[PDB]
PDB file of C-alpha atoms in Angstrom:
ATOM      1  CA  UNK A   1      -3.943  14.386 -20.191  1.00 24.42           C
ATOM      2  CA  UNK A   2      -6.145  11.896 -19.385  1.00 22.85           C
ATOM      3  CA  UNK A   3      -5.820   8.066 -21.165  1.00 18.93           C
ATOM      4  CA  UNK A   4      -4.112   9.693 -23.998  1.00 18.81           C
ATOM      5  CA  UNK A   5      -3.406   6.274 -24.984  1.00 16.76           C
ATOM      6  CA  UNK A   6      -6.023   3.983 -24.310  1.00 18.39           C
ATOM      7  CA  UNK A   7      -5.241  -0.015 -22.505  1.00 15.68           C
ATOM      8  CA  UNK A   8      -6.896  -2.985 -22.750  1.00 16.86           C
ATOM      9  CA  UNK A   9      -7.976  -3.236 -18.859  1.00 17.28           C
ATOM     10  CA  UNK A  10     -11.378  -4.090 -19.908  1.00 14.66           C
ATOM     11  CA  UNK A  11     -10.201  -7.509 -21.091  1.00 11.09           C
ATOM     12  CA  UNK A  12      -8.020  -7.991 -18.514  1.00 11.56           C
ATOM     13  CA  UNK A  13     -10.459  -8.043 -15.439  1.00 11.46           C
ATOM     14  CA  UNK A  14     -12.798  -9.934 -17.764  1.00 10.82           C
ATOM     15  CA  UNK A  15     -10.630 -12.763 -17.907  1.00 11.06           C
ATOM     16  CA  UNK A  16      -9.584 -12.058 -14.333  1.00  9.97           C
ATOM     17  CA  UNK A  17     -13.423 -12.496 -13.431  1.00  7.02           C
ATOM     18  CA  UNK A  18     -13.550  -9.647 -11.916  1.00  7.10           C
ATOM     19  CA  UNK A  19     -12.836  -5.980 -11.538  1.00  8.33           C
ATOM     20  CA  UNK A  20      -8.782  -4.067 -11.636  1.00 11.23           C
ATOM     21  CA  UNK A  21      -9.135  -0.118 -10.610  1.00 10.85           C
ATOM     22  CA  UNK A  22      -5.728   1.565 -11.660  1.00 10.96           C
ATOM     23  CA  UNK A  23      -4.295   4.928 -11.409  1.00 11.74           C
ATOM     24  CA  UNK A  24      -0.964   5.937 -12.667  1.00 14.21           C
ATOM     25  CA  UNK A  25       0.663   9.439 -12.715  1.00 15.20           C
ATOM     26  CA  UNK A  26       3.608  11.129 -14.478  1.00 17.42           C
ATOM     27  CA  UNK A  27       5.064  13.416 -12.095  1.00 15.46           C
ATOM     28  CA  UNK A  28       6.505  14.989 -15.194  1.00 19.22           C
ATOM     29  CA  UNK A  29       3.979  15.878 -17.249  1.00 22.68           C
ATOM     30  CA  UNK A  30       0.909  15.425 -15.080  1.00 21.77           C
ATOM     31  CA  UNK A  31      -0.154  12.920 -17.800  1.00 22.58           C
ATOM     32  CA  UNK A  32      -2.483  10.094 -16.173  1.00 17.80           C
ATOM     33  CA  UNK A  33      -3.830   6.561 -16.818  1.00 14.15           C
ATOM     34  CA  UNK A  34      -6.972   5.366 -14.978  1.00 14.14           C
ATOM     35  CA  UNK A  35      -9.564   2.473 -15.635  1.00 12.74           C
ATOM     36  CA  UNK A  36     -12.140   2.505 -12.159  1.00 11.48           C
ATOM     37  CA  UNK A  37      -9.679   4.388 -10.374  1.00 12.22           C
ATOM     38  CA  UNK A  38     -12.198   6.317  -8.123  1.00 14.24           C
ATOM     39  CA  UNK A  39     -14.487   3.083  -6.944  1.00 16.09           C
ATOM     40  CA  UNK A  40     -13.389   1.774  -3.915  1.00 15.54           C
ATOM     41  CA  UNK A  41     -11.420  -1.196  -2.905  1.00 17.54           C
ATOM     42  CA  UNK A  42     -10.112  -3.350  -0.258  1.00 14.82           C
ATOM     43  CA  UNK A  43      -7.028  -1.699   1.211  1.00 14.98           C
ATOM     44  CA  UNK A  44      -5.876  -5.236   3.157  1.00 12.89           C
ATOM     45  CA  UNK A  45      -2.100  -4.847   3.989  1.00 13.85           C
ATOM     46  CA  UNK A  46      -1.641  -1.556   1.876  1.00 15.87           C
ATOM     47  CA  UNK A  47      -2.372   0.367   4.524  1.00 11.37           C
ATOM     48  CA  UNK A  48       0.822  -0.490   6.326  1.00 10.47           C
ATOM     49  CA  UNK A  49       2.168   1.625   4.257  1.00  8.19           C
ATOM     50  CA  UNK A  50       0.560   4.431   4.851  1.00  8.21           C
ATOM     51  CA  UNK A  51       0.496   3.355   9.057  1.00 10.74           C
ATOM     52  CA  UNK A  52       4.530   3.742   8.615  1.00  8.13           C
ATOM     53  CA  UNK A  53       4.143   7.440   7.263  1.00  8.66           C
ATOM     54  CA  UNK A  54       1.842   8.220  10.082  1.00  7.00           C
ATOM     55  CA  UNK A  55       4.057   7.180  12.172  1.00 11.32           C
ATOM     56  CA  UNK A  56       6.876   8.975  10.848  1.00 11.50           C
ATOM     57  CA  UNK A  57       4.848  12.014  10.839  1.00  8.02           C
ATOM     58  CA  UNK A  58       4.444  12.106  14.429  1.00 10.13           C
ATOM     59  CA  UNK A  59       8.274  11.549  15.275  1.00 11.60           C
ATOM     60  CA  UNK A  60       8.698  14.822  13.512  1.00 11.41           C
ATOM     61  CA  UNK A  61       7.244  16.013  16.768  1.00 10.49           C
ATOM     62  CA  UNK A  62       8.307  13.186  18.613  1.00 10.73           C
ATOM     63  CA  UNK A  63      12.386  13.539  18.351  1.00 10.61           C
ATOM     64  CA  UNK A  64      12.454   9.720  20.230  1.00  9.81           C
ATOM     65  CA  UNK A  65       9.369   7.792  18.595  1.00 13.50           C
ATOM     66  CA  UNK A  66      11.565   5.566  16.167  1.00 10.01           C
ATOM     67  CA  UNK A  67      14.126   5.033  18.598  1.00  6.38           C
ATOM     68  CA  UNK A  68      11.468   3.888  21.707  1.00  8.31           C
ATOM     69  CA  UNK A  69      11.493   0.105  22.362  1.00  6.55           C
ATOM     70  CA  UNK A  70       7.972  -1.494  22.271  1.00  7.13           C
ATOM     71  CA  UNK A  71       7.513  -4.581  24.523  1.00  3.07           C
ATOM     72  CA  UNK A  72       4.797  -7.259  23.189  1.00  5.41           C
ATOM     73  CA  UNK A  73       3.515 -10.280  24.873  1.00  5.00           C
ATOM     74  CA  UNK A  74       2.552 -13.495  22.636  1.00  4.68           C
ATOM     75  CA  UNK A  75      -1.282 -12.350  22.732  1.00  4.39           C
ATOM     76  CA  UNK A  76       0.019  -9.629  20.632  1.00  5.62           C
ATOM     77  CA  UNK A  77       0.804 -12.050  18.026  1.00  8.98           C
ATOM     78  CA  UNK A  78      -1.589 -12.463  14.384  1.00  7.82           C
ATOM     79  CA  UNK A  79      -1.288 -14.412  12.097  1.00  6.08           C
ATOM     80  CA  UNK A  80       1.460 -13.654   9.375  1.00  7.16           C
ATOM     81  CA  UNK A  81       3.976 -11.539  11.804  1.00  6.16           C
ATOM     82  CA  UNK A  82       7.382 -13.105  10.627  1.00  4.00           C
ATOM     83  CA  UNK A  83       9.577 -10.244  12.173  1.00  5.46           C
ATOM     84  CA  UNK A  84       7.940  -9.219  15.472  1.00  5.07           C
ATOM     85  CA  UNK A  85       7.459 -13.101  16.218  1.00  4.13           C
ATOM     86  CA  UNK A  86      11.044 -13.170  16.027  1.00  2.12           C
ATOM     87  CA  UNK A  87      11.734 -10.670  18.612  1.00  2.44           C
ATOM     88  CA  UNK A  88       8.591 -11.713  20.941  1.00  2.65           C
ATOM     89  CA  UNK A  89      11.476 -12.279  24.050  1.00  2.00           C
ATOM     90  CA  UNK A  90      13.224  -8.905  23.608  1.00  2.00           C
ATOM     91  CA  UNK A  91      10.727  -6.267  21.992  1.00  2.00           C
ATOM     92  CA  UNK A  92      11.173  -4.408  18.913  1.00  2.00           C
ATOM     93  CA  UNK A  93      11.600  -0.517  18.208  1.00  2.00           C
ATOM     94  CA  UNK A  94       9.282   1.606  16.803  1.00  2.00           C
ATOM     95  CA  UNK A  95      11.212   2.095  13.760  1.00  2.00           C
ATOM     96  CA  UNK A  96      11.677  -1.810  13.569  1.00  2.00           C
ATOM     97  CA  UNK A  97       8.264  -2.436  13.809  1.00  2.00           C
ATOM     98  CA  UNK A  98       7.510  -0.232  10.941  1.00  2.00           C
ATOM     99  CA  UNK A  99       9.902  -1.530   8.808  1.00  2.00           C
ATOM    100  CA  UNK A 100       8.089  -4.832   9.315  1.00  2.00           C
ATOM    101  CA  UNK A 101       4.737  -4.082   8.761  1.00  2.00           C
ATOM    102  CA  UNK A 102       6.225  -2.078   5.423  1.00  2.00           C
ATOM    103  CA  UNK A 103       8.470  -4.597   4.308  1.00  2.00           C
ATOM    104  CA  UNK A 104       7.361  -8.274   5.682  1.00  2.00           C
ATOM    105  CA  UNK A 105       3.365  -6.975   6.406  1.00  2.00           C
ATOM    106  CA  UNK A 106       3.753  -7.896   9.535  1.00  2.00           C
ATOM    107  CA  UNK A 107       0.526  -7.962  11.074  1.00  2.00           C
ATOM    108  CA  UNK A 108       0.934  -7.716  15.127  1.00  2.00           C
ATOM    109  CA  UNK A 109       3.449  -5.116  14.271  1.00  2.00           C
ATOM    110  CA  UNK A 110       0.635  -3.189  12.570  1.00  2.00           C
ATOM    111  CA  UNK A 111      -1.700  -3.680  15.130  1.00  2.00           C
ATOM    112  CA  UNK A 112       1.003  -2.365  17.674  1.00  2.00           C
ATOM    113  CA  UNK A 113       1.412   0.655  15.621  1.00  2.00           C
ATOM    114  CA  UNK A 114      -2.323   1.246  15.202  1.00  2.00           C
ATOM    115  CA  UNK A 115      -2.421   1.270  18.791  1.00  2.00           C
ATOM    116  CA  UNK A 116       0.290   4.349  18.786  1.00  2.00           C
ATOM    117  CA  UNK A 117      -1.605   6.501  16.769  1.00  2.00           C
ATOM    118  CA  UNK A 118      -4.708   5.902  18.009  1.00  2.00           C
ATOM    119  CA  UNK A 119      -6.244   2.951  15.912  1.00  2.00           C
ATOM    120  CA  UNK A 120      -8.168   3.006  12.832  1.00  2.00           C
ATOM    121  CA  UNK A 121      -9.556   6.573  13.089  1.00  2.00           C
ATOM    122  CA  UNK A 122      -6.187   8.151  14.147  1.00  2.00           C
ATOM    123  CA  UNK A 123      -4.163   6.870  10.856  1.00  2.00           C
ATOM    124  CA  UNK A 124      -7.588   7.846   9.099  1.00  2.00           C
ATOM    125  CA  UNK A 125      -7.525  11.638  11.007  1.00  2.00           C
ATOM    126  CA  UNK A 126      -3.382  11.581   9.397  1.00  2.00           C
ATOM    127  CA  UNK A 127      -5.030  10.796   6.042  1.00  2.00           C
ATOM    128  CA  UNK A 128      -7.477  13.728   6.405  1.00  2.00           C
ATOM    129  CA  UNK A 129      -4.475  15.776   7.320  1.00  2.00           C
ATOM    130  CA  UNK A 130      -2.518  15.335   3.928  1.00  2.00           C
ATOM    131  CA  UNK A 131      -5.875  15.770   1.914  1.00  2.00           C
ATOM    132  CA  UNK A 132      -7.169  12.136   1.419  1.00  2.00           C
ATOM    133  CA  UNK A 133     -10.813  12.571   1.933  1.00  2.00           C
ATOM    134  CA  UNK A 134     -11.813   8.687   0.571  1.00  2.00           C
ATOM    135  CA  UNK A 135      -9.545   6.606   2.954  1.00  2.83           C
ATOM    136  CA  UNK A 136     -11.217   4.975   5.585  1.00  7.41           C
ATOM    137  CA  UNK A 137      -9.807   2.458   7.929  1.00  6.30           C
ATOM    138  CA  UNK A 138     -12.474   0.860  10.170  1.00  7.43           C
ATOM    139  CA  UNK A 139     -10.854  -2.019  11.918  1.00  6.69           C
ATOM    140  CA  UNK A 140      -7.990  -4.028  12.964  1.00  5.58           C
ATOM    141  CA  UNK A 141      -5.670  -7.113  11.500  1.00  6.20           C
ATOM    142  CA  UNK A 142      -7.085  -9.396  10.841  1.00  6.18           C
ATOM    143  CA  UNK A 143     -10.680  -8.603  11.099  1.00  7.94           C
ATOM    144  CA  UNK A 144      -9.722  -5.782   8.156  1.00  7.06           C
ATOM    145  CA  UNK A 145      -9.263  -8.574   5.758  1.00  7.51           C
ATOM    146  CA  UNK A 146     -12.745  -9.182   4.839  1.00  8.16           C
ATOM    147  CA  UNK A 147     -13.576  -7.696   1.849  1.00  7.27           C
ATOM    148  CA  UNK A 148     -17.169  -7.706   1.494  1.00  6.06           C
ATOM    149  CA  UNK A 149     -18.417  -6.458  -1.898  1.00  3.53           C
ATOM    150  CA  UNK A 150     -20.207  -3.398  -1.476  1.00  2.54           C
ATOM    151  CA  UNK A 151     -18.110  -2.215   2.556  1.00  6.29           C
ATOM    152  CA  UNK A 152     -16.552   0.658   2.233  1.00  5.05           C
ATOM    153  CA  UNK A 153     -14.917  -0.467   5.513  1.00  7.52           C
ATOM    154  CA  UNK A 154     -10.919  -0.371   5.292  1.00 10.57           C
ATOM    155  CA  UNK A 155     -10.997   0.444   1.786  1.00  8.46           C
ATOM    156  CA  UNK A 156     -10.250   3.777  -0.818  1.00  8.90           C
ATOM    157  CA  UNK A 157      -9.534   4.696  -4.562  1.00 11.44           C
ATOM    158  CA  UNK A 158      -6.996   3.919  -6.324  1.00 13.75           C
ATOM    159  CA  UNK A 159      -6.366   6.944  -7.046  1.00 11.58           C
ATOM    160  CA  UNK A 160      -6.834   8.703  -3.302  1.00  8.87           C
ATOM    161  CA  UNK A 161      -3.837   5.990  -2.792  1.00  9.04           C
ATOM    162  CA  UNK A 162      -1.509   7.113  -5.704  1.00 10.81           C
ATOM    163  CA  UNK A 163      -2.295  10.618  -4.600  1.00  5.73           C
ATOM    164  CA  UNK A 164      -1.509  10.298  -1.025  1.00  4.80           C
ATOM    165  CA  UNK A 165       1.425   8.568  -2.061  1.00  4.09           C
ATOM    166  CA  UNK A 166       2.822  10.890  -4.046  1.00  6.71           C
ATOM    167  CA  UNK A 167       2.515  13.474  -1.406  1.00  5.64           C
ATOM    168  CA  UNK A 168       4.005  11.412   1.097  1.00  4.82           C
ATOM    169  CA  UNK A 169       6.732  10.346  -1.302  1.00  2.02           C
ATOM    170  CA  UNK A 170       7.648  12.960  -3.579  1.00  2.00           C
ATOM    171  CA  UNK A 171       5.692  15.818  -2.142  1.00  2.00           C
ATOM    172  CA  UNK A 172       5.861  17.813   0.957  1.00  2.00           C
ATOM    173  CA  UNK A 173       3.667  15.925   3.140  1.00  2.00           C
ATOM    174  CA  UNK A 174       6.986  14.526   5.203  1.00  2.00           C
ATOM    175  CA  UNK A 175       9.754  16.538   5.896  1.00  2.00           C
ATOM    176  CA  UNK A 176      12.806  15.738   3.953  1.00  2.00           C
ATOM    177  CA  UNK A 177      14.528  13.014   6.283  1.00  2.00           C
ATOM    178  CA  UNK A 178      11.052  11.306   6.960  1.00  2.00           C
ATOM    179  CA  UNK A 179      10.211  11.220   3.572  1.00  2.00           C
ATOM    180  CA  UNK A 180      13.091   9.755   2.411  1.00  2.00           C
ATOM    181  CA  UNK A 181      13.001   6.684   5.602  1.00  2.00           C
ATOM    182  CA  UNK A 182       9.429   6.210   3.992  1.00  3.27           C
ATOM    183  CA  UNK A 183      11.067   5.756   0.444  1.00  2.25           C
ATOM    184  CA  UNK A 184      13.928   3.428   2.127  1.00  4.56           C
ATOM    185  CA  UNK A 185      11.158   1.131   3.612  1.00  2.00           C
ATOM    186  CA  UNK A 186       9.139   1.095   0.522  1.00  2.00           C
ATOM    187  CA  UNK A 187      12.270   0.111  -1.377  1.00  2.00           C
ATOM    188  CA  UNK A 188      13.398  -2.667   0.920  1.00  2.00           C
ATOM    189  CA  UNK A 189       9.870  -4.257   0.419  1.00  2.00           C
ATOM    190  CA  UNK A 190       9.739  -8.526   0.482  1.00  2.00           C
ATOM    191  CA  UNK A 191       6.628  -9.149  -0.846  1.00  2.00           C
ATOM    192  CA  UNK A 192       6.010  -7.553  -3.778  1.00  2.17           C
ATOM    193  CA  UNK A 193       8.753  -9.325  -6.158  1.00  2.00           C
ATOM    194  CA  UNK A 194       5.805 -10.493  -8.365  1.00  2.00           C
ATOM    195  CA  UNK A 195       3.284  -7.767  -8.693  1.00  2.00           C
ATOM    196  CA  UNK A 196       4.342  -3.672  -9.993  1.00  2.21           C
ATOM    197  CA  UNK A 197       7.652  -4.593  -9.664  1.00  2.00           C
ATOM    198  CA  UNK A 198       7.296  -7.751 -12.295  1.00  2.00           C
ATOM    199  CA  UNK A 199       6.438  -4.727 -14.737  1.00  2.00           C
ATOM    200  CA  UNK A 200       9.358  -2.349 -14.095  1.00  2.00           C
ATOM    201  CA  UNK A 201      12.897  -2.990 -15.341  1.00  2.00           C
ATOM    202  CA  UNK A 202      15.565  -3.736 -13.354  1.00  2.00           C
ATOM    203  CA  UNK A 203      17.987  -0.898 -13.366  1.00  2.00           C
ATOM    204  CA  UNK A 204      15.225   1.218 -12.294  1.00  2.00           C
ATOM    205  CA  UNK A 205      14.329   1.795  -8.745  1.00  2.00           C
ATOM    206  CA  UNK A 206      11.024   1.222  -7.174  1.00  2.00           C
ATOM    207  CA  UNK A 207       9.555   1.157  -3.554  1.00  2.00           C
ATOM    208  CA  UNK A 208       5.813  -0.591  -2.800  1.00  2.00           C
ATOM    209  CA  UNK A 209       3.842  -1.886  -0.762  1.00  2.00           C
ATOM    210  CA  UNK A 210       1.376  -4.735  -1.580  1.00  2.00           C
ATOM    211  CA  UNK A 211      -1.731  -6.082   0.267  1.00  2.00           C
ATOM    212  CA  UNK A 212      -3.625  -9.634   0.019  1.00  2.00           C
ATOM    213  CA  UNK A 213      -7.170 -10.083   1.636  1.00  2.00           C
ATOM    214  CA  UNK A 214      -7.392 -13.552   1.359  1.00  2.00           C
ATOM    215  CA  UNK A 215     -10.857 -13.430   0.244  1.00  2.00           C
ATOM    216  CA  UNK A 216     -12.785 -11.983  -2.720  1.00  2.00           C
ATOM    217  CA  UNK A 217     -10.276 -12.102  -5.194  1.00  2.00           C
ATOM    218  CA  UNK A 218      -8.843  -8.938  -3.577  1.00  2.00           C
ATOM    219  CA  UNK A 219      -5.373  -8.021  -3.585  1.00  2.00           C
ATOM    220  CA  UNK A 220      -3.331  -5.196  -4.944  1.00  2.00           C
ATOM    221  CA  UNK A 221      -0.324  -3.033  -4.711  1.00  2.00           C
ATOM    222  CA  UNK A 222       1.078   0.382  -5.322  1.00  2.00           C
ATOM    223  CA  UNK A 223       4.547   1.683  -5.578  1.00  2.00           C
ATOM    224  CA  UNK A 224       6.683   4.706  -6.857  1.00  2.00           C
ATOM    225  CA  UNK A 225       8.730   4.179  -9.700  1.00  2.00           C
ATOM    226  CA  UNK A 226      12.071   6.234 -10.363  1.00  2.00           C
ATOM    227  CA  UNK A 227      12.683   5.158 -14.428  1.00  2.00           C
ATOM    228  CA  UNK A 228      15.876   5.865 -15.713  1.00  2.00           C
ATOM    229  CA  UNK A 229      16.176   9.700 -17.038  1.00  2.00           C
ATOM    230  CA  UNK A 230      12.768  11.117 -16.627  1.00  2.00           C
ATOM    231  CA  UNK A 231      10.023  11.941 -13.659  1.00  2.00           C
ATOM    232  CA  UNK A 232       9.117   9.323 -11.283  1.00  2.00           C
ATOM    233  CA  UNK A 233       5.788   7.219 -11.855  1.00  2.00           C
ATOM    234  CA  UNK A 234       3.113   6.702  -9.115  1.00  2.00           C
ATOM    235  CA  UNK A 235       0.951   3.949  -9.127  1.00  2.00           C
ATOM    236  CA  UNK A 236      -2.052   1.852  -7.711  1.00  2.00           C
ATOM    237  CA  UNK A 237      -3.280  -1.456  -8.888  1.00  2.00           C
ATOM    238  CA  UNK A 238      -6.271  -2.703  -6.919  1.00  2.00           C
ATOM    239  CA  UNK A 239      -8.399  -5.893  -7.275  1.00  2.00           C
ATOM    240  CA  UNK A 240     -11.216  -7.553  -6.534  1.00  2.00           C
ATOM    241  CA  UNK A 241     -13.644 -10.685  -7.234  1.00  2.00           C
ATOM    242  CA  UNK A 242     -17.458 -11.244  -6.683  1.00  2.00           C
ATOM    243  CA  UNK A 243     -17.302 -14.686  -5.183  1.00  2.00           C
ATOM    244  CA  UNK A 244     -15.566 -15.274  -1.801  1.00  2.00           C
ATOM    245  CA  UNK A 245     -13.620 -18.056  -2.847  1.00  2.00           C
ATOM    246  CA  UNK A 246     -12.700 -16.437  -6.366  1.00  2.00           C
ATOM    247  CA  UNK A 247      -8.253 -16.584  -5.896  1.00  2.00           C
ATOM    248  CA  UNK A 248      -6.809 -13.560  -6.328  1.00  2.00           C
ATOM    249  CA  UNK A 249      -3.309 -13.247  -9.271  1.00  2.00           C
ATOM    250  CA  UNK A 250      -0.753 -11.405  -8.857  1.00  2.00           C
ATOM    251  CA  UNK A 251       0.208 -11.666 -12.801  1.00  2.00           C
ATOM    252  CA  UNK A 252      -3.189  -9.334 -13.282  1.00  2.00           C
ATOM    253  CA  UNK A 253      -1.494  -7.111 -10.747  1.00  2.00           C
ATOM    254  CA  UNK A 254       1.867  -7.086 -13.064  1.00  2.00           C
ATOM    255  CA  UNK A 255      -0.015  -6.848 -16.112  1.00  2.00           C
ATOM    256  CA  UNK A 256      -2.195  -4.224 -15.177  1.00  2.00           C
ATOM    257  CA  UNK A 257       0.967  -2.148 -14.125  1.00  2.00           C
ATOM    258  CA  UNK A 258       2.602  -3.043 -17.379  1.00  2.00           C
ATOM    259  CA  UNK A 259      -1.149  -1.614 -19.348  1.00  2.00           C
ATOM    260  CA  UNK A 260      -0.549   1.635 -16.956  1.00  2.00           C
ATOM    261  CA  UNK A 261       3.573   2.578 -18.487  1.00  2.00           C
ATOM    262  CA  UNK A 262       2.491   1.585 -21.746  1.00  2.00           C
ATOM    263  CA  UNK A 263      -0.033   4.278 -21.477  1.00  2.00           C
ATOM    264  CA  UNK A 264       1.626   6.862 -19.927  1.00  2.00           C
ATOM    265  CA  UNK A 265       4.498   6.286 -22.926  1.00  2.00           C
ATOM    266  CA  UNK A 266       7.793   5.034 -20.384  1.00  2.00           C
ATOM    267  CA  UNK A 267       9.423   2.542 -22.671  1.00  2.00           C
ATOM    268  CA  UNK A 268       9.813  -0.674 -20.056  1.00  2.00           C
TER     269      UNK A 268
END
């Protein structure tokens, strides 16, 4: 069930100038699409998302984790943290803090988070624990950002993403209520107005999370898609360049999602 249908991704990334890795799966039927889906690539800000689940994990243990107020002072502050700058003279709860590195990628909110669980090899150890044996986070925002071709430092498959996702969204990874906060944050998502959700049609509902390295032509995004009547979709679209300076599109990002329904057969 396999590209039953097969997409032209290979002319995409050519004119791109460099490589997309997709995986898409119909919850339905099981049927898949995937083009490079188990090389690796970049994470950047996508694993926020997957930070927020961790997080919510634990509070299943941890009956006042979302609630607990998190003081910060300003050398806590990165580049690119619209929220938690915001709230730098009053703190921000747990829960707040992962709704902004979900929804706004807010970057010293991550790296407060991190912190929580750990750092890179605790939200790597909650990976492990739901079955993802090709995520790997190595290191912090913003030193995560850069991309190297050929580090498998902060990066996985697309597929090991759509997989996890699934679990963590549809599956029984979460319990019920934490599951469905995940979903809520994923829906609310900012910054992802031009990338999966450019592909979907309106009056269906998605959640996502995106992530831009700034370097290396390397972006992506992946998101779970409820269309209208039938199984939900999950899907990851990642990118990346050769060159350092090659710019990264989000329009390949949208298109490539677009390639991935048309294959699976969801009329968009």
């Amino acid at each position: 069930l396999t590209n039953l249908v097969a997409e032209p991704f290979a002319k995409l990334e050519q004119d791109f100038g460099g490589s997309i890795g997709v995986y898409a799966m119909d919850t339905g039927s099981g049927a898949t699409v995937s083009y490079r889906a188990e090389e690796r690539f970049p994470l950047c800000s996508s694993f926020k998302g997957f930070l927020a689940a961790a997080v919510l994990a634990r509070s299943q243990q941890q009956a006042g984790l979302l609630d607990t107020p998190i003081r910060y002072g300003k050398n806590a502050l990165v580049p690119w943290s619209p929220i938690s700058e915001k709230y730098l003279t009053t703190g921000m709860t747990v829960a707040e803090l992962s709704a902004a590195a979900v929804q706004y990628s807010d970057n010293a909110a991550a790296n407060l988070l991190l912190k929580e669980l750990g750092g890179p090899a605790g939200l790597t150890a909650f990976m492990r624990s739901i079955g993802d044996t090709t995520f790997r986070l190595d290191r912090w925002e913003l030193e995560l950002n850069s991309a190297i071709p050929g580090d498998a430092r902060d990066t996985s498959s697309p597929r090991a993403v759509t997989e996890s996702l699934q679990k963590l969204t549809l599956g029984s990874a979460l319990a019920a209520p934490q599951r469905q906060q995940f979903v809520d944050w994923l829906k609310g998502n900012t910054t992802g107005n031009h990338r999966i959700r450019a592909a979907v049609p309106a009056d269906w509902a998605v959640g996502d999370k995106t992530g831009t390295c700034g370097v290396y032509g390397t972006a992506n995004d992946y998101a779970v898609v409820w269309p209208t009547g039938r199984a939900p979709i999950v899907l990851a679209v990642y990118t990346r360049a050769p060159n350092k300076d090659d710019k990264y599109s989000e329009a390949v990002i949208a298109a490539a999602a677009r390639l991935a329904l048309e294959g699976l057969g969801v009329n968009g």
